[PDB]
Amino acid sequence: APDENEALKRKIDAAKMPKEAKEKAEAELQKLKMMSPMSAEATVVRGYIDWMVQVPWNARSKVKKDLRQAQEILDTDHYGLERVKDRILEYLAVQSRVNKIKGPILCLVGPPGVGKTSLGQSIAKATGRKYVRMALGGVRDEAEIRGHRRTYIGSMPGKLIQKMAKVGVKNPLFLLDEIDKMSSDMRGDPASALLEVLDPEQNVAFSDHYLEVDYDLSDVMFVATSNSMNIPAPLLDRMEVIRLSGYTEDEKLNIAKRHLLPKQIERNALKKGELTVDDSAIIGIIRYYTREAGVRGLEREISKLCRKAVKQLLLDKSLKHIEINGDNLHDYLGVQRF
Ligand SMILES: Nc1ncnc2c1ncn2[C@@H]1O[C@H](COP(=O)(O)OP(=O)(O)O)[C@@H](O)[C@H]1O
DSSP states (O other): OOSTTTTTTTTTTSSOOOSTTHHHHHHHHTTOSSOSSOOTHHHHHHHHHHHHHSSOOSOOOOOOOOSHHHHHHHTTTTSOTTTTHHHHHHHHHHTTSSSOOOSOOOEEEOSBTBSSHHHHHHHHHHTTOEEEEEEOSSOOSSTTTSOOOSOSTTOOOOHHHHHHHHSOSSSEEEEEEOSTTOOOSSSSOHHHHHHHHHOTTTSTTEEOSSSOSEEOOTTOEEEEEOSSSOOOHHHHTTOOEEEOOOOOHHHHHHHIIIIIHHHHHHHTTOOTTSEEEOHHHHHHHHHHTOOOSSSHHHHHHHHHHHHHHHHHHHSOTTOSOEEEOSSSTHHHHOSOOO
């Protein structure tokens, strides 16, 4: 009879819905229809029904079957990283057939700084797949992967259930950033809940504590990246280990010239010809302002380098263009660190 109390079915059957969750959603509506300003149940089910709609099922993005188009971008987001470029392609060649992903999840390990999350961005762009990230740092219980019960207010579903609410497709690229930091002390171990989400036998029967009914996940392509090897043994099993650590000066220079410099020039509100940073200034950042195997502090210095450039142009409009080389790099980054 009311407006919102009647506008619940406007997205239960209008939006797609499976079989076991169809009438079960209305079975949860059975606890309603009695009153409306009532509290507890009349306020939890409406939130529960709301969380039952924003979750995607029978709705996905079309993944292509092409292969070189992925090779065409695995050299775009970087270059190839010597080898390993083929691996990512080798993994996507077998996934171009039956939808059950099934294979070892893929694990991008290495020192902090190496393109781990960035590689996860390209694999989603390669297969036309949507991207979402879930950092596994600070998780110390099972109440994160699998949500809480359907108690009073607050008890929201699992973290992955909330990520599916954003990316409204059944086939997103779920990144598990830094699985090393995943602690297992409080409520059992999140690795047990992390097994049923990637294991091919029970990924289709993933049950969340809040969202009562199960939720298929055999169409999601998971990418679990980290740094060290401190991961639970049942997780390392059935996961493809990909190691990448080495980074030379010339490799850091190429990454900065193709990606790090164009990215920070744009973010810092600089136009195309407003800032020129030649190769010596990039090398000077590597040798005296950043010590690292990856390129994170290399990118941290450019975010400051382009920062001061837009500052100098704003404090002196008589400047149309700032040039930074190995000689005047210390005027912007301050004194050298190493
Ligand atoms: N080999 C690389 N090629 C291109 N860009 C890179 C590379 N390595 C790192 N990056 C840059 O680093 C950023 C993200 O770093 P990330 O890989 O997330 O660090 P971490 O692995 O420590 O989380 C991206 O924006 C990306 O442009």
